[PDB]
Amino acid sequence: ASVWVMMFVMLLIVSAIAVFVFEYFSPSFTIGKAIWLLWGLVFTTSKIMVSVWAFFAVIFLAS
Amino acid sequence: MIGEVVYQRAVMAVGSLTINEERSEVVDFSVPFVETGISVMVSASVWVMMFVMLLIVSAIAVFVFEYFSPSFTIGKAIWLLWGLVFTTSKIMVSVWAFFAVIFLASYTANLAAFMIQRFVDQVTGLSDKKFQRPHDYSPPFRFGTVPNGSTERNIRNNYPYMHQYMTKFNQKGVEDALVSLKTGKLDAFIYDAAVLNYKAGRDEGCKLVTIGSGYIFATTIALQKGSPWKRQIDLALLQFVGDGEMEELETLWLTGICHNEKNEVMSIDNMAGVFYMLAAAMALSLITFIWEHLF
Amino acid sequence: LTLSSAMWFSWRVLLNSGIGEGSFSARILGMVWAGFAMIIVASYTANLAAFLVLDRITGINDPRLRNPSDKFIYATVKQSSVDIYFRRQVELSTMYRHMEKHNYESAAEAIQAVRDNKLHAFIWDSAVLEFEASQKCDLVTTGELFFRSGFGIGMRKDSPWKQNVSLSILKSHENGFMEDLDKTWVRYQEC
Amino acid sequence: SFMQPFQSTLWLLVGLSVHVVAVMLYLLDRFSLTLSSAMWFSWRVLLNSGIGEGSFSARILGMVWAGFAMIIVASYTANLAAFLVLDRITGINDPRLRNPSDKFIYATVKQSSVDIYFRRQVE
Amino acid sequence: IVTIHQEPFVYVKPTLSDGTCKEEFTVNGDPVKKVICTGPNDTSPGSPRHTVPQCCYGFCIDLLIKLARTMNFTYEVHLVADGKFGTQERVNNSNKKEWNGMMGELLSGQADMIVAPLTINNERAQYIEFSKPFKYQGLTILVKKEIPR
Amino acid sequence: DSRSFENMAGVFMLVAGGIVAGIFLIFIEIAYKRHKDAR
């Protein structure tokens, strides 16, 4: 029950972080592509940090 | 007991008597008090199939890249095969990739069968020179007894050098042994192993391993000599054993917790495994970077 | 994207070869499907561990023996002390209609009867049994040591040489000549 | 339930091994991609984000490493199932009661028939 | 001594064509203690039982030679016709409770020593009293091993 | 009842603290790498 809400919260956090990092490559679609990447990682330097949390999601799969 | 027998203070004497051959010289005896003796208390083919099938699929990839001609099967497709252990024919390989994932699931169930179904022990017995040459091991081994024992007489018969070791450590109580095991002051203990079988089961946590999984060393009631009671005793004795009434006393007095010993495995790990396998890997580079394009 | 594309994308992602990328609503739906695929893998590999890792004769205490069936017929050899330890005690009355009605002339006949799968179990002196269990892999000695006798020597009552034999017998235990025969005749094989 | 139970030293060994991967990838470039490439490829494949693609000898070695990574995942998830799924008072039959300790003190109410069924029997 | 065909205690194996025991060796390569043992060939009733002396192997031979050393005896070693201990069983006229087998053979004078690992009897000790026993065991149970899946 | 998480909450706290430290170093490291790419 409560684990589910935590999952929704953390995925929205990382999606917003992706939006900001795509805003700070400006000094490809966070609405599009990056979210389906987030979906794939439930199951580009910040993307390294997401691969960390992808490995986390794999840990949650094992759990 | 033996003074009370010889000087006939106790005309009958029962005890938990370690009936010695020495005592049998001095005193007549009935059957052994219980079984006893001296104990020590202390705290392939799947692989070849994999190689065959991967070479098959690599050759099939070579042929399918030959029949796109109506990107490197030497290169790229093999590292793809590696990735799929862990383009229409590539759909058929994704089938066998899903197969390889099934084989991953199978040997996860297998390694679960390994890492559940460990129990280990250290001391053999007198065959250890741990006992025989304790100072030839660091730390030197730490073994004592309660003095004037028959087992001590047996080791005088065996190794009074070992008694020279024991007198560095010899005790006076069983609770002395309980402390020196639970405080590590003496390493393990050998006595009449039946007492160890009570109190080992009656240990708290039962880590104080005894004289092997009950390996009786010093293997196998006083009668004043010429007592007419002996046949009466010993025929009665068969019936007691022929009735199993000693076993009823066993149900009375024996057990603690090692009676419910429960396959004491691990419950994080530090097996070698890869510590073997790492020793391979670097030498692989030592193969290849000598084989450079010399001409 | 209408002929063989999303075929091979279903075989990409439903096989989870490519788990990530490969309008938005179909993608929502497909990543829900990939979540299902992960769940299905989790359940079947849980079954792989389960149905491999998940879920006998104890002795006289069995109702197999306390209520001895004819699906569990057992036997001995006649003229044995084994049958004496039978016929002394009381509640083997149900058992004597097995252990006196089916018996053998050698224990090897009963050993073969285990090997020929004739009778289900046998009750013999533990030494040869545990030997051959260590020697051949048809044999599990279950139960306890029943009637825990000693193994002594046929000496007449007026035979006076129990005595120095018993002194030797004592030197045997005290100096491990018992243990020497354990080296030389007992402690050999395994399964 | 917990944090990691799995021996923090082993986790440090994981970090050391990942940097060993980085070293072995970046050295063999010049012998036949040198700054932050094979860093992020070790984080691709050692995390098994991209398990497939991403000279030949370094690739042999790296796919052996990915095999290791799969083994490590298999072992620790086996421990995830294990240490969660793997390994009392039964009655009068306890030696807790047959040998009643003062770590196990028990009681009743006096003037009870409970105490009568006590005081009738022997042991 | 009459010997029940009890292996390894007495491996009763045949001799050579010489009528002699061989020179067989242990796991330690040691010349195994072998004993000429007289008794039947077709060791079953109603079969022509031919008393052949045959090679014998075991614990008890080792012990008897220990007692030849410590005790200075010779040992007259035979095979059982019955292969059996032999208990008090009734003869025809249906009352004659008589020790058979090995018990009979001592109590007939025919064996004068039983060298065998004998499970002691309160009852056998009422007639034939043991020395100190060797092994402290009991009856256990051979069970078939189940096959794999 | 019959009992049918804390590991979860520990993972929440660890991953949250790591991502916060990472993001508040992102801007600094982007600025300094713009200075280094000026080189």
Side-chain angles (χ1 to χ4, degrees), chain A residues 1-29 31-63, chain B residues 1-72 74-117 122-258 268-295, chain C residues 1-54 56-191, chain D residues 1-86 88-123, chain E residues 1-91 95-145 148, chain F:
Chain A
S2 66
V3 178
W4 298 87
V5 177
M6 296 299 290
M7 293 302 293
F8 287 107
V9 170
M10 295 301 291
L11 291 174
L12 291 175
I13 291 168
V14 179
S15 67
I17 293 170
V19 174
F20 285 106
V21 177
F22 284 112
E23 291 178 354
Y24 283 92
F25 296 115
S26 64
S28 65
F29 296 98
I31 299 169
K33 298 175 183 177
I35 293 171
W36 310 111
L37 291 173
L38 291 175
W39 279 103
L41 295 176
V42 173
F43 306 109
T44 61
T45 61
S46 69
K47 296 182 183 179
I48 302 167
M49 297 303 294
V50 177
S51 67
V52 176
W53 290 273
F55 177 80
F56 278 101
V58 176
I59 296 166
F60 295 116
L61 293 171
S63 67
Chain B
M1 303 294 286
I2 302 168
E4 293 170 354
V5 166
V6 168
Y7 313 111
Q8 293 184 356
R9 308 169 188 172
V11 177
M12 300 303 292
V14 176
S16 66
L17 293 178
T18 64
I19 295 175
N20 293 322
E21 183 280 335
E22 296 176 353
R23 291 177 182 174
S24 71
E25 295 165 353
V26 178
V27 181
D28 283 335
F29 288 97
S30 69
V31 208
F33 177 80
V34 129
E35 294 176 28
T36 194
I38 297 171
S39 284
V40 186
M41 183 172 267
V42 293
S43 190
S45 66
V46 178
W47 298 87
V48 177
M49 296 299 290
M50 293 302 293
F51 287 107
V52 170
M53 295 301 291
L54 291 174
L55 291 175
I56 291 168
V57 179
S58 67
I60 293 170
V62 174
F63 285 106
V64 177
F65 284 112
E66 291 178 354
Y67 283 92
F68 296 115
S69 64
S71 65
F72 296 98
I74 299 169
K76 298 175 183 177
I78 293 171
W79 310 111
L80 291 173
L81 291 175
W82 279 103
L84 295 176
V85 173
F86 306 109
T87 61
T88 61
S89 69
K90 296 182 183 179
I91 302 167
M92 297 303 294
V93 177
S94 67
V95 176
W96 290 273
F98 177 80
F99 278 101
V101 176
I102 296 166
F103 295 116
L104 293 171
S106 67
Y107 274 94
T108 56
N110 288 317
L111 290 174
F114 287 109
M115 297 304 292
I116 294 168
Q117 300 174 356
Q122 295 176 357
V123 174
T124 70
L126 295 175
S127 65
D128 289 331
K129 293 180 182 178
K130 301 175 184 178
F131 301 95
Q132 299 174 355
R133 298 173 183 175
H135 299 279
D136 293 333
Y137 299 96
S138 66
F141 285 89
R142 299 174 184 176
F143 289 94
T145 57
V146 180
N148 295 315
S150 65
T151 62
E152 295 178 350
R153 298 178 178 177
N154 295 317
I155 299 166
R156 296 167 195 169
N157 299 317
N158 290 318
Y159 309 96
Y161 296 98
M162 215 153 297
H163 284 294
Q164 298 168 355
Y165 302 122
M166 298 301 286
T167 54
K168 306 168 185 176
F169 309 111
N170 279 322
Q171 288 180 352
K172 291 181 182 179
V174 180
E175 295 178 353
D176 296 332
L178 293 175
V179 173
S180 65
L181 289 177
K182 289 181 180 179
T183 58
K185 296 176 185 177
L186 298 183
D187 297 332
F189 286 98
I190 296 170
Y191 291 99
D192 299 333
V195 173
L196 301 172
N197 291 317
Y198 300 110
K199 297 176 181 177
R202 294 166 181 173
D203 286 330
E204 295 177 353
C206 297
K207 290 184 179 180
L208 303 181
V209 182
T210 80
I211 152 194
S213 69
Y215 292 101
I216 293 168
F217 296 97
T219 61
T220 61
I221 292 172
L223 297 173
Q224 288 186 355
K225 290 189 172 180
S227 68
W229 308 98
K230 297 177 181 177
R231 291 181 180 177
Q232 308 167 357
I233 291 165
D234 293 329
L235 294 172
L237 177 63
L238 188 147
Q239 293 177 335
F240 296 160
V241 178
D243 295 331
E245 300 174 356
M246 300 299 290
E247 301 169 352
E248 303 168 354
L249 287 173
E250 290 173 353
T251 60
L252 295 176
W253 304 98
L254 290 179
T255 62
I257 303 168
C258 291
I268 294 172
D269 291 330
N270 288 316
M271 293 298 291
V274 179
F275 291 103
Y276 292 99
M277 306 303 289
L278 291 173
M282 297 299 291
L284 297 175
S285 66
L286 299 174
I287 298 168
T288 61
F289 295 99
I290 297 171
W291 290 102
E292 294 178 353
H293 299 285
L294 296 175
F295 295 97
Chain C
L1 292 175
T2 57
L3 292 174
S4 66
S5 68
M7 291 295 290
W8 294 356
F9 290 116
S10 65
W11 296 107
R12 179 180 296 176
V13 181
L14 293 175
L15 291 177
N16 283 313
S17 69
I19 302 169
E21 286 178 351
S23 66
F24 290 101
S25 65
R27 299 171 185 174
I28 296 167
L29 292 173
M31 298 311 293
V32 173
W33 289 104
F36 284 116
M38 298 299 288
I39 292 166
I40 291 165
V41 173
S43 65
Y44 277 94
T45 54
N47 292 320
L48 293 177
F51 296 99
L52 293 177
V53 176
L54 292 178
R56 291 182 180 178
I57 296 169
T58 64
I60 302 169
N61 297 317
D62 293 330
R64 300 175 184 177
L65 293 177
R66 292 179 179 178
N67 297 318
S69 66
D70 294 331
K71 296 181 181 180
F72 293 106
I73 295 171
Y74 303 106
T76 56
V77 173
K78 296 176 181 176
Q79 289 188 0
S80 66
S81 65
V82 180
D83 289 333
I84 293 174
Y85 296 114
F86 278 106
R87 294 173 185 174
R88 288 185 178 180
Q89 289 184 356
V90 171
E91 297 176 354
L92 301 174
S93 64
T94 64
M95 289 299 295
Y96 304 129
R97 297 181 178 179
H98 298 281
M99 311 310 288
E100 299 176 351
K101 293 184 181 179
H102 298 282
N103 292 324
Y104 297 107
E105 290 181 353
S106 71
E109 296 175 356
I111 295 166
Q112 293 166 355
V114 174
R115 295 174 187 174
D116 300 330
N117 294 319
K118 298 179 186 177
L119 301 183
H120 306 280
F122 286 99
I123 299 170
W124 290 101
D125 289 330
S126 63
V128 181
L129 305 186
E130 292 166 353
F131 287 156
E132 294 171 352
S134 67
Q135 292 171 357
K136 290 184 180 180
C137 299
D138 290 331
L139 302 175
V140 173
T141 61
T142 62
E144 291 181 354
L145 298 174
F146 297 110
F147 291 98
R148 296 181 182 179
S149 68
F151 289 86
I153 300 168
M155 295 296 290
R156 296 179 183 176
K157 291 187 177 182
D158 292 333
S159 63
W161 299 103
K162 300 171 184 174
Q163 300 171 358
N164 292 321
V165 167
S166 65
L167 299 173
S168 67
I169 186 167
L170 295 174
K171 296 178 182 179
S172 70
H173 291 281
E174 285 167 352
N175 301 317
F177 296 103
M178 303 300 293
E179 304 168 353
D180 291 331
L181 293 180
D182 294 331
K183 298 173 187 178
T184 60
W185 295 97
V186 172
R187 293 178 181 177
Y188 283 95
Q189 299 185 1
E190 290 178 354
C191 287
Chain D
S1 64
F2 298 109
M3 304 306 291
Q4 296 177 357
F6 300 108
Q7 292 179 357
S8 66
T9 63
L10 297 174
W11 302 90
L12 296 174
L13 293 173
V14 171
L16 294 173
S17 63
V18 171
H19 293 290
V20 170
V21 173
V23 172
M24 293 302 294
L25 290 174
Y26 287 117
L27 290 176
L28 302 178
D29 298 330
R30 296 178 182 177
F31 298 100
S32 68
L33 292 175
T34 57
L35 292 174
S36 66
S37 68
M39 291 295 290
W40 294 356
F41 290 116
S42 65
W43 296 107
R44 179 180 296 176
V45 181
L46 293 175
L47 291 177
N48 283 313
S49 69
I51 302 169
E53 286 178 350
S55 66
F56 290 101
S57 65
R59 299 171 185 174
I60 296 167
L61 292 173
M63 298 311 293
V64 173
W65 290 104
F68 284 116
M70 298 300 288
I71 292 166
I72 291 165
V73 173
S75 65
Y76 277 94
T77 54
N79 292 320
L80 293 177
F83 296 99
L84 293 177
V85 176
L86 292 178
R88 291 182 180 178
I89 296 169
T90 64
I92 302 169
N93 297 318
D94 293 330
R96 300 175 184 177
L97 293 177
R98 292 179 179 178
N99 297 318
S101 66
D102 294 331
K103 296 181 181 180
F104 293 106
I105 295 171
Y106 303 106
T108 56
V109 173
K110 296 176 181 176
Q111 289 188 0
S112 66
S113 65
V114 180
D115 289 333
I116 293 174
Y117 296 114
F118 278 106
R119 294 173 185 174
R120 288 185 178 180
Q121 289 183 356
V122 171
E123 297 176 354
Chain E
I1 301 165
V2 183
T3 59
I4 306 169
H5 309 284
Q6 292 178 355
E7 302 189 352
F9 294 90
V10 177
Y11 296 110
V12 181
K13 297 177 184 175
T15 57
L16 286 169
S17 66
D18 299 331
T20 64
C21 288
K22 301 179 184 179
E23 292 181 355
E24 292 172 352
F25 291 96
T26 58
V27 178
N28 297 319
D30 299 333
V32 180
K33 289 185 179 182
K34 305 185 182 184
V35 172
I36 286 170
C37 299
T38 63
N41 284 330
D42 297 333
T43 64
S44 64
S47 66
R49 286 183 176 176
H50 314 289
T51 62
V52 170
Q54 295 175 358
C55 288
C56 292
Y57 304 86
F59 296 90
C60 299
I61 294 169
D62 312 336
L63 299 172
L64 289 174
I65 295 171
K66 293 174 185 178
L67 296 175
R69 297 162 188 173
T70 59
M71 294 302 292
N72 296 319
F73 291 100
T74 65
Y75 302 99
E76 291 172 345
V77 180
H78 309 290
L79 299 171
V80 192
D82 295 332
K84 291 180 178 182
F85 299 98
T87 64
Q88 283 179 356
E89 296 170 354
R90 288 175 177 178
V91 185
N95 283 316
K96 297 171 182 176
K97 297 180 180 180
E98 299 179 357
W99 289 104
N100 301 319
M102 299 303 293
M103 289 293 291
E105 287 175 355
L106 288 184
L107 294 176
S108 60
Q110 291 175 356
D112 291 335
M113 291 297 294
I114 298 173
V115 179
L118 297 173
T119 60
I120 294 169
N121 298 339
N122 226 325
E123 293 175 353
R124 290 185 179 178
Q126 293 167 357
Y127 298 95
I128 293 168
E129 291 174 353
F130 295 93
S131 66
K132 291 176 183 172
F134 298 114
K135 300 178 182 181
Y136 303 101
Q137 300 176 358
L139 295 172
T140 59
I141 298 166
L142 292 175
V143 175
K144 303 171 186 175
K145 289 188 184 179
Chain F
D1 288 330
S2 66
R3 292 181 181 177
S4 66
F5 301 101
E6 294 178 353
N7 287 314
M8 293 292 289
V11 172
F12 285 115
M13 295 300 290
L14 293 176
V15 174
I19 291 172
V20 171
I23 294 173
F24 285 95
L25 292 176
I26 284 174
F27 299 98
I28 299 169
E29 292 170 352
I30 288 175
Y32 282 99
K33 285 186 178 182
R34 289 173 184 174
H35 295 292
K36 290 181 181 180
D37 290 331
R39 297 178 181 177

